[PDB]
Amino acid sequence: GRLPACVVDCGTGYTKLGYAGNTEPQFIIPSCIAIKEGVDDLDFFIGDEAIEKPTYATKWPIRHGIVEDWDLMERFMEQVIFKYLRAEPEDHYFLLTEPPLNTPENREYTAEIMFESFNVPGLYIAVQAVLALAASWTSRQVGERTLTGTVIDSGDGVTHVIPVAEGYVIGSCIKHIPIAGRDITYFIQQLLRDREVGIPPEQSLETAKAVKERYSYVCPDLVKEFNKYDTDGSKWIKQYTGINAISKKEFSIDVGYERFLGPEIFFHPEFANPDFTQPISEVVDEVIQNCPIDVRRPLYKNIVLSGGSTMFRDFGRRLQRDLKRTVDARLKLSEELSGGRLKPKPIDVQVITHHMQRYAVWFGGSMLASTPEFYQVCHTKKDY
């Protein structure tokens, strides 16, 4: 441990960089590369210096949780290592992150880019589920620490539900909900471009993202909230002030019914996707009840949340209430099927929220890589 390990997590919308043993990432940047379209190969910019730049074509080399172009990911990693982290790759261990359901070809090309081009002494590619579940222990009681749970991996691409039992991932029972944050901001944009005038066309996405991040929450029932909005408008209606890109003319808009119809499309995907109609309360149940029969109870007792799109207020409460409602009826049916002589034990359903929820994968990577025995796990240079 003469120098700490490096942790880099690559995503569809953001990339997180840092050193092992720290609680927070040192850099959360967008995953954008901008180039110009000799030594013209190195004339490029990454991250916040690539969102707007006049004479430079920008693009995104990660889409849907897979790599589309590798010539761009190589350069992205060069300027991750040599500009921001400022680490020589010849004397640091690396802990990268793979998407769920990754091919061996995609896993091996990363090792090629690392070993053959950077002389990395050691590399470790880790699944996201166990690292997400490891971070759950920071805000849990001392008497309960296990590697058994179900992770609802949300974010910017597609939402996964992955169960893990005793340290390993059960590959068959992984299911995808195609809803994520990008769909939520696309939905709230269409809501806002029907009622309010004063939004320039260029800054529509930025205003939608700001309204999503600042004011947004979930409600038990929709009709009561709609009634409360009209009955008493002063309490539940706020104003948002923005700065124009041209001539600095300030503008104002009112936030109304788009506050709590934004994160509702998790629980009612037919509002915004016509080809999918199954609420998330049922996908978790159907994934849990397709597993081995001896590990059904511990998975319900530990349903952790990892990802930025689970950051809304009272998100876990709806999952808890719906899952309790849909398991109680099933136990009632089973009890009535066998008369009334014996009452089964009610299943305890629980969802755990933490302070560390936006960057849980990076935190798990930092905790795993700080242990002394981590250096006995990685693949060395001679193995390749």
Partner: peptide, 17 residues
Amino acid sequence: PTSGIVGALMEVDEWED
């Protein structure tokens, strides 16, 4: 393994209706 991780952890109402 799990032992190293757990050892390194410390070192470093309107709804029922």
